[PDB]
Ligand binder design. Structure first.
Ligand SMILES: *O=[P@@]([O])(O[C][C]1O[C](N2[C]=NC3=C2N=[C]N=C3[N])[C]([O])[C]1[O])OP([O])(=O)OP([O])([O])=O
Ligand SMILES: *O=[P@@]([O])(O[C][C]1O[C](N2[C]=NC3=C2N=[C]N=C3[N])[C]([O])[C]1[O])OP([O])(=O)OP([O])([O])=O
Ligand SMILES: Nc1ncnc2c1ncn2[C@@H]1O[C@H](COP(=O)(O)OP(=O)(O)OP(=O)(O)O)[C@@H](O)[C@H]1O
Ligand SMILES: Nc1ncnc2c1ncn2[C@@H]1O[C@H](COP(=O)(O)OP(=O)(O)OP(=O)(O)O)[C@@H](O)[C@H]1O
Lengths: 261, 261
């Protein structure tokens, strides 16, 4: 319960705590910390949680999570976490763990959770909340979380819907300016059902023609949280994560929640 | 049949042909070319295959594939390919297609095939054959392909087995030099069953302590083909591709076959 947060010897995971700390503060929920594994082992794990907690003390301001759990568990990280997610509000995990290197940008753990966790997965790296919408049901999650979030974080929001999932458009003379304004209407429509629910949060909406990732990504540089579902309109048979989710998760410069289950 | 090769408007895929051309020459098999999709559409696809063929002419030397197939198919790339793989020797696909951008290093298609294709997937980017072994059954494929390959390509090979799948080792005073020589023996053992089968191919074997990807990768700089299975010893429940496969595929500087099915 509360917001779990896998920890290891990486600076990405260090930082994963600060952001789990404050999110379990802004809601009155337990900040559980889990370090799985396969003794220097046990003794190492001890130090990790000692430092992880040392981060939590620094991180939070006024309250300090109603409970601060942590547990070293002798088991395969993924199976452990995936299972523990079932009874968790959120799954916080660094993008890259110890055993990372240059070209890489995900890992056995972060990768697997985005593909199997039973709760929105948050991958953090090292004021408004940007949201990637296509009304594709898996994002009507994501938009939910995005509002909920921007309430407790007493701020603004930014919706963003790309018209085409396939790139180029360089198709024939389709009237972009006109199909655009009508996508802007349609988007405005399905954020009205929220806009009420949540006054005090300014809904800014943006419609683009083309690539929905290189833009969510990018424009993440200007927000403090990006949110996008684990799946969407399109996608094939045994897929576990949207190609647009994963990519935004591994490339954005801001925490990226990825709604699931 | 033969060696299929998904094509699109990307230079990675351009190059994918040259390497499909010559591999379908070195064996007497058909060089089928497939461009799926969802008209400028049909007319665009036509140009792709015109150019794709123009590459095949340039690429091959002496013979020119016993058949050169190609087919534009109105369907989701992945489903199409995955299905067509079933009756194919190999699946050649560029790493990154048109609609790529900086931080990215796989795509809906290449990603999905490494996770669902029914034949060894080859991802190419833009003299010996390096092989990533752990005796984990999925690599006794890979080693098979690696030899088969280095025969027809009348050259050498290089086996490589990392002792530990988990990184650091910085565990207690385990005798590395000694566990090493005994991993070198054990590796030498299970390449003896091949060494015969395939004289004229020099089996060079390397045992390392640690990270099996940052090394397969890297040392790919010096070989002309890297080979590694779709899975291995370890890995969790509903996994579709090894974390070591994928990573070597997306970061090596040489074609990377990834045995499967
Ligand atoms: O296309 P996906 O990867 O997307 C899943 C999530 O990505 C976000 N998203 C999807 N499509 C758009 C978008 N944001 C803005 N604009 C557009 N057009 C959304 O939040 C989804 O939750 O998932 P798929 O489509 O199942 O997998 P692919 O596209 O890779 O086949
Ligand atoms: O560990 P994997 O990703 O590996 C699958 C393939 O990778 C190669 N390989 C695996 N382990 C080694 C290796 N090469 C050299 N040395 C070592 N130690 C091999 O060719 C395999 O085919 O697959 P997993 O283990 O199922 O998934 P992870 O490790 O990510 O949990
Ligand atoms: N054993 C573990 N227990 C709990 N959390 C973990 C564990 N390993 C990693 N994590 C967390 O999950 C995230 C993903 O780390 P991961 O280990 O997948 O990256 P990596 O080490 O670079 O890749 P790999 O481990 O596959 O070599 C990290 O941010 C880390 O905080
Ligand atoms: N519609 C298609 N038909 C056949 N082959 C394709 C098709 N699309 C891509 N390919 C091939 O598969 C490989 C993967 O391309 P992919 O499209 O996945 O990369 P990308 O376009 O950068 O990512 P995405 O398409 O998800 O935005 C490329 O090398 C390309 O040659």
């Amino acid at each position: 319960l509360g917001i779990i947060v896998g920890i290891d010897d990486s600076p990405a995971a260090q930082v994963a705590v600060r952001w789990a700390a404050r999110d379990a503060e802004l809601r009155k929920i337990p900040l559980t910390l889990v370090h799985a594994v396969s003794r220097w082992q046990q003794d190492h794990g001890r130090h990790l949680i000692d430092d992880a907690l040392k981060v939590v003390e620094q991180a939070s301001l006024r309250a300090g999570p109603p409970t601060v759990h942590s547990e070293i568990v002798p088991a395969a990280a993924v199976p452990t976490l995936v299972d523990m997610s079932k009874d968790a509000v959120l799954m916080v995990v660094g993008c890259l763990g110890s055993g990372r290197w240059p070209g890489r940008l995900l890992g056995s753990v972060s990768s697997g959770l985005l593909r199997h966790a039973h709760c929105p997965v948050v991958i953090i790296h090292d004021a408004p909340v940007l949201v990637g919408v296509d009304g594709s049901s898996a994002s009507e999650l994501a938009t939910a979380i995005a509002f909920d979030e921007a309430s407790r974080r007493n701020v603004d929001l930014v919706a963003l819907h790309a018209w085409s999932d396939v790139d180029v458009s360089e198709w024939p003379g389709i009237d972009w300016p006109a199909t655009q304004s009508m996508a802007e209407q349609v988007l405005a429509e399905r954020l009205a059902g929220w806009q009420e629910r949540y006054p005090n949060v300014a809904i800014t909406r943006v419609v683009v023609r083309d690539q929905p990732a290189r833009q969510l990504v990018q424009r993440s540089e200007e927000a403090q949280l990006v949110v996008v579902g684990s799946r969407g309109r399109g996608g094939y048979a045994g897929m576990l994560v949207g190609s647009v989710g994963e990519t935004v998760a591994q490339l954005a410069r801001t925490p990226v929640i990825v709604a699931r289950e």
